[PDB]
Design a protein around this ligand. Structure first.
Ligand SMILES: [Cl-]
Ligand code: NA
Ligand code: NA
Length: 129
């Protein structure tokens, strides 16, 4: 599924991401835009052999099991394919564990390089939330 911007904002809010660990909703929408272009089916392979999955590009070395990342932890206890669903619940629940791990949203490279320090509220401007 490819979400619209406000559609994704509303889904993320319903799933408790607004201000989760202090990160306003716009941060999460911005991260999703630049991680996946709002596409739940996005995948990208990394140089170390891990793969990133879904709207928030969650990595198979630490967070989910894709059966082909040796020595990987499965800290969200989910198959990585569950992160590609049109229902973002599994991605959101795993993202909550990631953002609580110490480094906050700096875990998402695109957030650090393209959202951090910008006016992220623009990502939810105009939405009926
Ligand atoms: Cl980047
Ligand atoms: Na893909
Ligand atoms: Na992989």
């Amino acid at each position: 599924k490819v979400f619209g911007r406000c559609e994704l904002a509303a889904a993320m809010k319903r799933h408790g991401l607004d201000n989760y660990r202090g990160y306003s909703l716009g941060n999460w929408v911005c991260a999703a835009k630049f991680e996946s272009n709002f596409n739940t089916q996005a995948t990208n392979r990394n140089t170390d052999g891990s793969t990133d999955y879904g709207i928030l590009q969650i990595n198979s070395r630490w967070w989910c099991n894709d059966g082909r990342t040796p020595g990987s932890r499965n800290l969200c206890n989910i198959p990585c394919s569950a992160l590609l669903s049109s229902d973002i619940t599994a991605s959101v629940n795993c993202a909550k564990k990631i953002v609580s791990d110490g480094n906050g949203m700096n875990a998402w490279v695109a957030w650090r390089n393209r959202c951090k320090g910008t006016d992220v509220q623009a990502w939810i401007r105009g939405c009926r939330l």
